[PDB]
Amino acid sequence: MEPLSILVRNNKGRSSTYEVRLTQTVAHLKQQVSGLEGVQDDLFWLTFEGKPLEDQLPLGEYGLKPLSTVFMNLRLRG
Amino acid sequence: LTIEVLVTVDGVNFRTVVLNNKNTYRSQLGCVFFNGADISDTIPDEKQNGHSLYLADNLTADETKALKELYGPVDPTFLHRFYSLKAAVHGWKMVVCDKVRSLKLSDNNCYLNAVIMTLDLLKDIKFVIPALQHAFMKHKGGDSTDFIALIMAYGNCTFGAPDDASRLLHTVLAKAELCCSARMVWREWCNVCGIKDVVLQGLKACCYVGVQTVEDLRARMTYVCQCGGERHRQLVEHTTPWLLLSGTPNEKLVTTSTAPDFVAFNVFQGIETAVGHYVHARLKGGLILKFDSGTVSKTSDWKCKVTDVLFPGQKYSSD
Ligand SMILES: [Zn+2]
Ligand SMILES: [Zn+2]
Ligand SMILES: [Zn+2]
Numbered sequence: 001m002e003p004l005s006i007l008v009r010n011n012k013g014r015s016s017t018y019e020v021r022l023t024q025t026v027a028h029l030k031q032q033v034s035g036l037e038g039v040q041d042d043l044f045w046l047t048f049e050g051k052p053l054e055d056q057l058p059l060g061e062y063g064l065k066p067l068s069t070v071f072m073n074l075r076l077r078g
Numbered sequence: 079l080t081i082e083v084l085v086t087v088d089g090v091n092f093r094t095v096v097l098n099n100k101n102t103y104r105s106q107l108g109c110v111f112f113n114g115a116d117i118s119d120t121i122p123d124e125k126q127n128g129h130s131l132y133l134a135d136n137l138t139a140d141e142t143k144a145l146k147e148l149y150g151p152v153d154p155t156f157l158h159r160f161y162s163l164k165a166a167v168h169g170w171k172m173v174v175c176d177k178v179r180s181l182k183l184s185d186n187n188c189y190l191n192a193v194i195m196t197l198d199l200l201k202d203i204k205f206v207i208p209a210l211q212h213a214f215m216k217h218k219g220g221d222s223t224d225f226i227a228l229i230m231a232y233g234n235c236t237f238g239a240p241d242d243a244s245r246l247l248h249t250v251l252a253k254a255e256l257c258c259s260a261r262m263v264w265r266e267w268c269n270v271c272g273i274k275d276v277v278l279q280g281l282k283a284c285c286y287v288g289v290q291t292v293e294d295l296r297a298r299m300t301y302v303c304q305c306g307g308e309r310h311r312q313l314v315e316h317t318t319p320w321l322l323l324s325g326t327p328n329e330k331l332v333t334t335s336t337a338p339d340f341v342a343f344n345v346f347q348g349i350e351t352a353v354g355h356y357v358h359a360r361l362k363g364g365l366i367l368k369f370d371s372g373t374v375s376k377t378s379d380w381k382c383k384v385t386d387v388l389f390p391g392q393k394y395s396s397d
Contacts, residue, residue, distance in 0.1 A: 015302075045242070045245045050285070050287045052248045052252060065304060075241070076241075076243070076245075076354065077240035077242070077353045077354065078192075078346055078347075078354045
């Protein structure tokens with residue numbers, strides 16, 4: 001059971017590669033994005049195909065394939 | 079001397095624990111709630127003798143799976159957060175504004191007003207999790223304390239802090255289901271890989287984060303394919319009882335004179351790099367009803383930053 005490469009795109013339109021396992025949590029991916037982008041976890045949330053990614057669920061539950069594009073969304077404070 | 083207490087997570091299964099009156103509940107058992115109040119840091123006495131307590135810390139193996147049965151697959155911190163959040167929002171109030179209920183402003187809960195008032199318009203939804211569906215029915219009956227606290231617990235919202243109405247609204251709907259049929263069909267193609275149709279049904283065909291108009295939802299999209307080429311995707315069929323589209327704050331001129339197609343929307347006031355303010359708006363009788371945390375005012379025209387937009391039912395087929 002080996003990892004695969006997905007893409008996360010930030011507010012500016014830049015896609016970066018991330019080696020993930022479908023068994024890892026969304027929270028674990030959010031930590032990878034936080035490290036690469038330099039933004040804390042509670043400042044953004046992730047969407048795939050217009051659906052939010054729940055932190056405690058595994059990535060395999062969203063049908064991510066190699067080079068799938070996940071979107072980084074700023075988490076507003078109102 | 080010593081008291082016997084009934085410990086429960088579900089209200090129908092109980093475990094007996096005998097405690098002394100020498101140490102607090104927290105040291106002998108864990109954090110406990112009695113009639114909605116936290117009594118973990120008090121010493122047990124005879125007033126709680128023979129009474130049921132709602133335990134949050136140090137759940138047993140059986141109580142944990144009863145917890146997953148009631149609340150879904152939640153983390154160990156969940157029960158403590160929900161019980162504490164529920165008694166923290168005890169003073170909050172749902173105020174009637176122009177025949178509908180709105181959350182009065184308290185402790186930066188304006189984002190919750192946008193979420194709840196938007197949910198109140200979706201009158202065809204149901205929650206699969208029993209505790210969430212129960213709190214939802216209690217909310218629609220007039221008692222919203224449970225629903226508010228559960229929503230904040232599932233959303234990882236910290237009390238008294240601002241948050242994101244769009245994120246919370248779509249996170250809640252991910253736990254819901256539609257009581258009628260709905261369907262959206264995407265067509266995806268790549269000049270090397272070929273063409274394929276993707277079908278979604280139910281409530282998932284009614285929410286989308288990324289666009290804020292139906293025209294943008296129906297436009298062609300292009301992005302890198304697994305082969306390295308350019309892949310395309312385009313909506314080809316859409317039948318829903320309503321449609322919720324959300325995106326970043328986008329300044330628009332909402333106007334009655336043109337009679338727009340959406341029925342409700344949320345507004346973020348302020349700049350997005352800073353703490354702002356949410357308003358929930360609805361179109362009724364040729365005016366925009368602006369629900370600002372227990373107050374309501376009406377305008378025919380409003381320049382505002384739109385986030386969530388609620389459209390009516392969709393009947394669409396293309397190509
Ligand atoms: Zn505790
Ligand atoms: Zn506690
Ligand atoms: Zn391809």
